[PDB]
Design a protein around this motif. Structure first.
Motif, PDB file in Angstrom:
ATOM      1  N   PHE A 189       0.830  -1.204   0.000  1.00 37.34           N
ATOM      2  CA  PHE A 189       0.000   0.000   0.000  1.00 37.34           C
ATOM      3  C   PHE A 189       0.865   1.255   0.000  1.00 37.34           C
ATOM      4  N   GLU A 190       1.873   1.296   0.873  1.00 40.10           N
ATOM      5  CA  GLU A 190       2.689   2.491   1.032  1.00 40.10           C
ATOM      6  C   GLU A 190       3.580   2.768  -0.174  1.00 40.10           C
ATOM      7  N   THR A 191       3.661   1.853  -1.134  1.00 37.16           N
ATOM      8  CA  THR A 191       4.463   2.077  -2.327  1.00 37.16           C
ATOM      9  C   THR A 191       3.639   2.549  -3.518  1.00 37.16           C
ATOM     10  N   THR A 192       2.325   2.692  -3.368  1.00 39.33           N
ATOM     11  CA  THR A 192       1.483   3.095  -4.488  1.00 39.33           C
ATOM     12  C   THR A 192       1.564   4.603  -4.698  1.00 39.33           C
ATOM     13  N   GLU A 193       1.328   5.026  -5.941  1.00 40.99           N
ATOM     14  CA  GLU A 193       1.206   6.457  -6.198  1.00 40.99           C
ATOM     15  C   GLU A 193       0.065   7.060  -5.387  1.00 40.99           C
ATOM     16  N   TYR A 194      -1.057   6.336  -5.283  1.00 37.49           N
ATOM     17  CA  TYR A 194      -2.199   6.809  -4.500  1.00 37.49           C
ATOM     18  C   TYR A 194      -1.771   7.223  -3.086  1.00 37.49           C
ATOM     19  N   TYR A 195      -0.955   6.400  -2.434  1.00 39.98           N
ATOM     20  CA  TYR A 195      -0.518   6.700  -1.071  1.00 39.98           C
ATOM     21  C   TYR A 195       0.243   8.024  -0.993  1.00 39.98           C
ATOM     22  N   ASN A 196       1.146   8.266  -1.941  1.00 39.80           N
ATOM     23  CA  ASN A 196       2.046   9.409  -1.848  1.00 39.80           C
ATOM     24  C   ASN A 196       1.465  10.680  -2.429  1.00 39.80           C
ATOM     25  N   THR A 197       0.362  10.584  -3.157  1.00 41.28           N
ATOM     26  CA  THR A 197      -0.215  11.772  -3.760  1.00 41.28           C
ATOM     27  C   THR A 197      -1.556  12.088  -3.101  1.00 41.28           C
ATOM     28  N   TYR A 198      -2.596  11.333  -3.454  1.00 43.86           N
ATOM     29  CA  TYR A 198      -3.941  11.656  -2.988  1.00 43.86           C
ATOM     30  C   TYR A 198      -4.082  11.423  -1.481  1.00 43.86           C
ATOM     31  N   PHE A 199      -3.697  10.231  -1.006  1.00 43.70           N
ATOM     32  CA  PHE A 199      -3.865   9.869   0.404  1.00 43.70           C
ATOM     33  C   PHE A 199      -3.154  10.851   1.327  1.00 43.70           C
ATOM     34  N   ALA A 200      -1.853  11.059   1.095  1.00 41.83           N
ATOM     35  CA  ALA A 200      -1.074  11.955   1.941  1.00 41.83           C
ATOM     36  C   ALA A 200      -1.712  13.332   2.032  1.00 41.83           C
ATOM     37  N   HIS A 201      -2.350  13.795   0.960  1.00 43.84           N
ATOM     38  CA  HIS A 201      -2.958  15.115   1.015  1.00 43.84           C
ATOM     39  C   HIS A 201      -4.354  15.101   1.640  1.00 43.84           C
ATOM     40  N   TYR A 202      -5.231  14.199   1.188  1.00 41.18           N
ATOM     41  CA  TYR A 202      -6.644  14.275   1.549  1.00 41.18           C
ATOM     42  C   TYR A 202      -7.017  13.486   2.796  1.00 41.18           C
ATOM     43  N   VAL A 203      -6.197  12.518   3.207  1.00 46.73           N
ATOM     44  CA  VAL A 203      -6.498  11.630   4.325  1.00 46.73           C
ATOM     45  C   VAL A 203      -5.470  11.780   5.442  1.00 46.73           C
ATOM     46  N   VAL A 204      -4.183  11.799   5.081  1.00 47.73           N
ATOM     47  CA  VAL A 204      -3.043  12.151   5.926  1.00 47.73           C
ATOM     48  C   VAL A 204      -2.588  10.960   6.762  1.00 47.73           C
ATOM     49  N   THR A 205      -3.399  10.506   7.729  1.00 43.25           N
ATOM     50  CA  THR A 205      -2.894   9.443   8.599  1.00 43.25           C
ATOM     51  C   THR A 205      -3.775   8.197   8.684  1.00 43.25           C
ATOM     52  N   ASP A 206      -5.037   8.336   9.107  1.00 39.67           N
ATOM     53  CA  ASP A 206      -5.909   7.182   9.303  1.00 39.67           C
ATOM     54  C   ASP A 206      -7.247   7.431   8.626  1.00 39.67           C
ATOM     55  N   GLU A 207      -7.985   6.349   8.396  1.00 40.68           N
ATOM     56  CA  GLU A 207      -9.250   6.461   7.691  1.00 40.68           C
ATOM     57  C   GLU A 207     -10.194   5.372   8.171  1.00 40.68           C
ATOM     58  N   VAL A 208     -11.484   5.708   8.257  1.00 37.04           N
ATOM     59  CA  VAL A 208     -12.530   4.696   8.330  1.00 37.04           C
ATOM     60  C   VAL A 208     -13.553   5.037   7.268  1.00 37.04           C
ATOM     61  N   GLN A 209     -14.366   4.049   6.926  1.00 36.83           N
ATOM     62  CA  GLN A 209     -15.397   4.247   5.924  1.00 36.83           C
ATOM     63  C   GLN A 209     -16.617   3.417   6.294  1.00 36.83           C
ATOM     64  N   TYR A 210     -17.796   4.031   6.230  1.00 38.41           N
ATOM     65  CA  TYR A 210     -19.050   3.282   6.183  1.00 38.41           C
ATOM     66  C   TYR A 210     -19.374   2.940   4.732  1.00 38.41           C
ATOM     67  N   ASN A 211     -19.611   1.651   4.453  1.00 39.36           N
ATOM     68  CA  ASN A 211     -19.929   1.144   3.112  1.00 39.36           C
ATOM     69  C   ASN A 211     -21.370   0.671   3.087  1.00 39.36           C
ATOM     70  N   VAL A 212     -22.171   1.231   2.195  1.00 37.23           N
ATOM     71  CA  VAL A 212     -23.579   0.883   2.068  1.00 37.23           C
ATOM     72  C   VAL A 212     -23.835   0.418   0.641  1.00 37.23           C
ATOM     73  N   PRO A 213     -23.986  -0.886   0.422  1.00 41.05           N
ATOM     74  CA  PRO A 213     -24.359  -1.381  -0.911  1.00 41.05           C
ATOM     75  C   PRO A 213     -25.671  -0.755  -1.367  1.00 41.05           C
ATOM     76  N   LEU A 214     -25.684  -0.273  -2.607  1.00 41.97           N
ATOM     77  CA  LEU A 214     -26.893   0.301  -3.186  1.00 41.97           C
ATOM     78  C   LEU A 214     -27.609  -0.667  -4.100  1.00 41.97           C
ATOM     79  N   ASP A 215     -26.855  -1.530  -4.760  1.00 42.42           N
ATOM     80  CA  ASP A 215     -27.419  -2.581  -5.583  1.00 42.42           C
ATOM     81  C   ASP A 215     -26.300  -3.589  -5.814  1.00 42.42           C
ATOM     82  N   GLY A 216     -26.417  -4.378  -6.882  1.00 42.68           N
ATOM     83  CA  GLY A 216     -25.401  -5.375  -7.153  1.00 42.68           C
ATOM     84  C   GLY A 216     -24.058  -4.799  -7.549  1.00 42.68           C
TER      85      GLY A 216
END
Lengths: 168, 168
Positions: free
Chosen positions: B98-125
């Motif tokens: 995970f820590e080697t992905t571009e996502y981690y070093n660009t988007y995550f580091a800026h918009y999330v920073v350290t930790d994250e949780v998510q509520y996931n609600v299926p809407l359909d299939g």
């Protein structure tokens, strides 16, 4: 704590379901002796009954209420006179000749029995969404206090339920 | 007690308003260090961003997320693999690279920073409605416990909010 969050989730989940008003009345009935209930919209024409506990060959008393007896319902009259809405308790809003009306001896005695409160939510300049909660006993000060404590989200929920009412 | 009922009413009142997700994240932020948030729908195509804290000339990082970097988002992948939905905490769902992905070093580091949780609600299939809550610190066991306690009505609310989303 704990059980209250699951109760709230079941109520919010019902917001687009036919049994929403039953679940709302049962939720409030955990704090008070709610023995009957009705949800309806008052206006300058006939009341529109959205849901009520005994809903189903219809009782001719319901038709009588809709076509005229509601005019003697103190809760209809307060919807015309108190246009901000709110929480109303029977004893605070009756006229003195309330007990002499046909409404009292026919519809009220059967569908409400002893005491009543209502949440009134103005929908526009003419319509008022109302949740009536009736009891065969009396709602005391502690119950009224509770109804006022919960009122912020009761009336928010009621207003949002309009989006899922098809008759509206 | 008391203040919680008014908070709930303000949240329910916002259900059909543009700022609903901000009010939901701020409500949950009373129990936990929520420093950023986003609401979005994952699917088999590009993510649809419904609302996010820094929403507005758009940051090219948002477009990069939508057109491809979301594929490296561990929270997108869990939406494809855990089709019942639920409550997910970052550390439980990452790959080792995970820590080697571009996502981690660009988007995550800026918009999330350290930790994250998510509520996931299926809407359909295919579609999953997600509320991401990010922190510059860590969500501890007590915070996760709280998120699970409130989850029954959080996910009920999220599902009902879909009716008032126009992009959907």
């Amino acid at each position: 704590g704990g059980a209250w969050h699951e109760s709230l989730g079941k109520l919010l989940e019902a917001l687009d379901r036919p049994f929403f008003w039953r679940i709302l009345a049962q939720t409030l009935g955990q704090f008070a002796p709610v023995d009957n209930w009705a949800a309806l919209i008052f206006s300058d024409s006939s009341p529109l009954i959205l849901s009520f506990m005994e809903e189903e060959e219809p009782d001719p008393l319901i038709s009588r209420y809709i076509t005229g007896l509601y005019l003697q319902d103190p809760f209809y009259q307060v919807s015309r006179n108190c246009r901000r809405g709110g929480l109303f308790h029977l004893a605070d809003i009756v006229s003195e000749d309330f007990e002499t009306t046909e409404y009292y001896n026919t519809y009220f005695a059967h569908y409400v029995v002893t005491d009543e409160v209502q949440y009134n939510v103005p929908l526009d300049g003419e319509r008022t969404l109302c949740l009536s909660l009736g009891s065969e006993s009396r709602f005391g000060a502690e119950q009224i206090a509770l109804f006022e404590l919960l009122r912020p989200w009761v009336i928010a929920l009621m207003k949002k339920r309009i989006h899922f009412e098809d008759a509206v």
